[PDB]
Design a protein around this ligand. Structure first.
Ligand SMILES: [K+]
Ligand SMILES: [K+]
Ligand SMILES: [K+]
Ligand SMILES: [K+]
Ligand SMILES: [K+]
Ligand SMILES: [K+]
Ligand SMILES: [K+]
Ligand SMILES: [Mg+2]
Ligand SMILES: [Mg+2]
Ligand SMILES: [Mg+2]
Ligand SMILES: [Mg+2]
Ligand SMILES: [Mg+2]
Ligand SMILES: [Mg+2]
Ligand SMILES: [Mg+2]
Ligand SMILES: [Mg+2]
Ligand SMILES: [Mg+2]
Ligand SMILES: [Mg+2]
Ligand SMILES: [Mg+2]
Ligand SMILES: [Mg+2]
Ligand SMILES: [Mg+2]
Ligand SMILES: [Mg+2]
Ligand SMILES: [Mg+2]
Ligand SMILES: [Mg+2]
Ligand SMILES: [Mg+2]
Ligand SMILES: [Mg+2]
Ligand SMILES: [Mg+2]
Ligand SMILES: [Mg+2]
Ligand SMILES: [Mg+2]
Ligand SMILES: [Mg+2]
Ligand SMILES: [Mg+2]
Ligand SMILES: [Mg+2]
Ligand SMILES: [Mg+2]
Ligand SMILES: [Zn+2]
Lengths: 111, 147, 118, 53, 49, 101
RNA sequence: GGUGUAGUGGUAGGAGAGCGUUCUAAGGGCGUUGAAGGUCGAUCGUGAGGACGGCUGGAGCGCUUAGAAGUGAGAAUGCCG
RNA sequence: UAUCCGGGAGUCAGACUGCGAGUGAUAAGAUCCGUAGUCGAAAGGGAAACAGCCCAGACCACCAGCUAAGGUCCCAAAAUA
RNA sequence: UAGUGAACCAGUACCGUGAGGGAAAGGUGAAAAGCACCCCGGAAGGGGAGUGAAAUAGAUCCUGAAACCGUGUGCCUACAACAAGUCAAAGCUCGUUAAUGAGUGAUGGCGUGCCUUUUGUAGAAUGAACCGGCGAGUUACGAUUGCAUGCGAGGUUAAGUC
């Protein structure tokens, strides 16, 4: 009743690289987090920004919370399903390639 | 019953002793001082807790070296660079840096661990008969019978 | 009549892991490393249940020696004197008195010195 | 050369200690008050040094 | 006798001994065959006589 | 006041109103037990048994009989495909000290 | 069952006695008022191991006696994931 | 305790130490025997560390005691006897 | 991971010039009642609202272990040389199958993994990246010995018929 969460599942991005941007914004006011994500050039910044804006929209529309008070109480990236691929190498062999996916969760609380 | 007394850090009082090294063999002085620093002279001795007393050594320049140790006892140390072995005779150490002589002797007799190094810090050596620790109200510690 | 692996294997390995709880990283997480460390822990524990008695007797002897020196006597002289005086108080009780009841330990030392003199 | 021993989680995390991002130079824009990078045009209002561009 | 209380005569039946099922059983690992040699191989041993 | 008594091949310090754990005593719970081998009595004065204080005794009541935490003896020799596991729970008697004489 | 005496390191290996797994028969039971399974716990036995409670789970499963084995894994540059 | 009768094995690479010989050079942690011990298959204490040396054979619990080899100024228990 | 290679569009996909070789892959719910409508988003995916007994049963759908990854934090950690434990232990934190409790642990003592093969291995000899599953003295017919049962100078049926 005081918090709202948004999740983006099976997003094609490195969980570790995404966790870098998530560490930037964790435990910050929603406005500060939005600014940080907008000015971060890393790819996951935009995806995390969409999830954060979705969470804020949930907090407002679904639960009628005060936007100005909102802060990023929790945020994390879990590993998702990994697609298997193969890259040919020299001398007629192949090496596996792990195309990773991420479950990005953002939880925003009133205070 | 598991009732053996175990000392705690800070509860036990550490006194301050003054030891005169004048014409006392280096090793025997170091041995008595090492026991005192470890706290082996007090019933409350606890091996895993520091319980010994501070020691101030005076007249370190007059410590005794029997035999030819003054010229033949050689202290080595390696810089860890190739061919980086350095030496200095015990007599030269006594003449120039007596504090180092006593401290090296006592280091050898203290345990080689965290507690041992902390106990070593409680040592204070001074060539000459005067020390700056009058504020600690140290008391003389006769050792003639302890050596 | 086929008997598949079932749950017995998991039960056994989980027992080992619970014993290994608190170990560093893989030593508490992985069954094989956990079992090896638990075996070494058993070896050390059996050995230490015997070393522990040695260590405490050693500690009591040291404390009794300090108290005896303060009373004007060596540990060896004190024990010999107590044996002569027929005192059977053991080293655990002697060290306890030295730390706690200095007066009682002093009385014991006086009796030991008297026996030695005789 | 190949890793003689696998890298444990603790050592791996220690090495990644310094593998972190940073965000610097953000401060309020004069024209609209939104956050902007210093010495850069405020992307929202397109103003810099108090003028539109 | 009752089917829920059957009881063989004492010593009439014994338990089969299974080898290669742990060290503490006394027949683990080598299964009582020893170490190496011809008799330690599957189908090992020389013909009778 | 306090006493030191000989019990179970070991010497224990005892004070009135204190519970002590000793090797199993062949006595029922809630029954009186008397330790008649007092090797010392201390307090305001000191009585030193040589080896035992004459006519000195300590009284107690057997509160409980119990078993200590299990001890596991696991003997094995590396590379010799051999191990032996054993459990133990030493019985004990908890006795409350009532009187020291 | 009690007292006494003596004994109780152990590889190859021999002997004895047991734990646990799946299934069969009989008897006696347990389960949408929650089985098996999973997970947690500071529980019991001399050992393999056995209970009990919380949570998860959603339909089968113990117990006693006897019987039959695809009956116990940590290693095989083992196989598959 | 020995025989005998029968069921089941494993073993046929040994090592060192002391003593008595050979081969060797009166060398080898060499080699080959005889003999005794230990290791092998033996944990514990001493020899700094150190399978084979010295003392000694772990069924277990104890924050009890006496000793063996070896030790008692400090590391480090015990004599600055 | 069993059972036919194949419980499923399998001798298929795939591999090979060809003969030939040859897989993986079962489970929503009683019933699709398979999430109308609204909100963020380009979508994907979510948050509400609903269906349902249950949606952390939402189609990667029963259960959902371990490795592996991540979040939060009760305790410890930047003078320390560590087969990582064990024995002793202050401090701090917590209150259990209520037990002479639990977690963590400054500090001190002791201490060179497991397996294989060896006279001898911490071994700078061998094997294991980790976790999970599978994976090795069995059966048939005979021989012989022990144990047990029935009968006993006797014992016993085989094929075959019902
Ligand atoms: K055999
Ligand atoms: K393997
Ligand atoms: K010989
Ligand atoms: K479900
Ligand atoms: K953690
Ligand atoms: K330690
Ligand atoms: K090699
Ligand atoms: Mg090519
Ligand atoms: Mg298995
Ligand atoms: Mg002893
Ligand atoms: Mg059978
Ligand atoms: Mg055997
Ligand atoms: Mg094995
Ligand atoms: Mg083999
Ligand atoms: Mg061989
Ligand atoms: Mg053989
Ligand atoms: Mg079942
Ligand atoms: Mg099997
Ligand atoms: Mg495996
Ligand atoms: Mg030789
Ligand atoms: Mg061998
Ligand atoms: Mg030995
Ligand atoms: Mg060995
Ligand atoms: Mg024995
Ligand atoms: Mg003695
Ligand atoms: Mg000493
Ligand atoms: Mg669930
Ligand atoms: Mg599921
Ligand atoms: Mg330093
Ligand atoms: Mg520090
Ligand atoms: Mg060799
Ligand atoms: Mg390897
Ligand atoms: Zn602006």
């Amino acid at each position: 009743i005081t918090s709202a969460k948004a999740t983006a599942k099976t997003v094609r991005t490195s969980p570790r690289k995404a966790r870098l941007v998530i560490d930037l914004i964790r435990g910050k006011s929603v406005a500060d987090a939005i600014s940080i994500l907008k000015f971060t050039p890393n790819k996951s910044a935009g995806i995390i920004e969409k999830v954060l804006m979705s969470a804020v929209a949930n907090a407002e529309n679904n639960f009628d919370l005060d936007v100005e008070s909102l802060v990023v109480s929790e945020a994390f990236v879990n590993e998702g399903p990994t697609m298997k691929r193969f890259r040919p190498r020299a001398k007629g062999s192949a090496s596996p390639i792990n195309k990773r996916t991420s479950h990005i969760t953002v939880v925003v609380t009133e205070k | 019953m598991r009732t053996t007394y175990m000392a705690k850090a800070g509860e036990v009082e550490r006194k301050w002793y003054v030891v005169d090294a004048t014409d006392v063999p280096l090793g025997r002085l170091s041995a008595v001082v090492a026991s005192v620093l470890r706290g082996k002279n007090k019933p409350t001795f606890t091996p895993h807790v520091d319980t010994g007393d501070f020691v101030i050594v005076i007249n370190a320049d007059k410590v005794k070296l029997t035999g030819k140790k003054a010229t033949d006892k050689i202290y080595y140390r390696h810089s860890m660079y190739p061919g980086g072995l350095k030496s200095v005779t015990a007599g030269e150490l006594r003449d120039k840096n007596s504090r180092r002589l006593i401290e090296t002797s006592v280091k050898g007799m203290l345990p080689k661990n965290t507690l041992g190094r902390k106990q070593f810090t409680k040592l204070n050596v001074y060539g000459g008969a005067e020390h700056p620790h009058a504020a600690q109200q140290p008391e003389v510690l006769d050792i003639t019978n302890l050596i | 009549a086929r008997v598949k692996g079932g749950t017995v294997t998991r039960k056994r390995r989980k027992k080992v892991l619970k014993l290994a709880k608190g170990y560093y990283g893989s030593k508490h997480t992985l069954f094989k490393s956990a079992k090896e460390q638990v075996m070494n822990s058993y070896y050390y524990a059996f050995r230490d249940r015997r070393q522990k008695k040695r260590d405490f007797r050693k500690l009591w002897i040291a404390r009794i020696n300090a108290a005896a020196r303060m009373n004007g006597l060596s540990y060896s002289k004190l024990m010999h004197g107590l044996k002569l005086a027929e005192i059977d108080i053991n080293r655990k009780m002697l060290a306890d008195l030295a730390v706690n009841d200095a007066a009682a330990f002093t009385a014991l030392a006086e009796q030991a010195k008297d026996a030695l003199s005789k | 050369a190949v890793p003689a021993r696998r890298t444990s989680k603790a050592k791996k995390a220690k090495r990644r200690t310094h593998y972190k991002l940073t965000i610097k130079g953000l401060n309020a824009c004069s024209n609209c008050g939104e956050m902007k990078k210093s010495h850069h045009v405020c992307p929202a209002c397109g103003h810099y040094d108090g003028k539109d561009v | 006798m009752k089917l829920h209380e059957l009881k063989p005569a004492e010593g009439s039946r014994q338990v089969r001994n299974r080898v290669g099922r742990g060290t503490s059983s006394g027949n683990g690992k080598t299964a009582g065959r020893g170490q190496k040699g011809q008799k330690a191989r599957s189908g090992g041993g020389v013909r009778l006589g | 006041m306090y006493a030191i008594i000989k019990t179970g091949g070991k010497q224990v310090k005892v004070e009135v109103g204190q519970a002590i754990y000793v090797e199993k005593l062949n006595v029922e719970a809630g029954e009186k037990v008397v330790f008649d081998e007092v090797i010392l009595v201390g307090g305001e004065s000191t009585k030193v048994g040589a080896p035992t204080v004459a006519g000195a005794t300590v009284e107690g009541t057997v509160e409980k009989h119990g078993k200590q935490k299990k001890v596991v003896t696991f003997q094995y020799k590396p590379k010799k495909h051999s191990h032996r596991k054993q459990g133990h729970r030493q019985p004990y008697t908890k006795v409350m000290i009532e009187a020291i004489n």
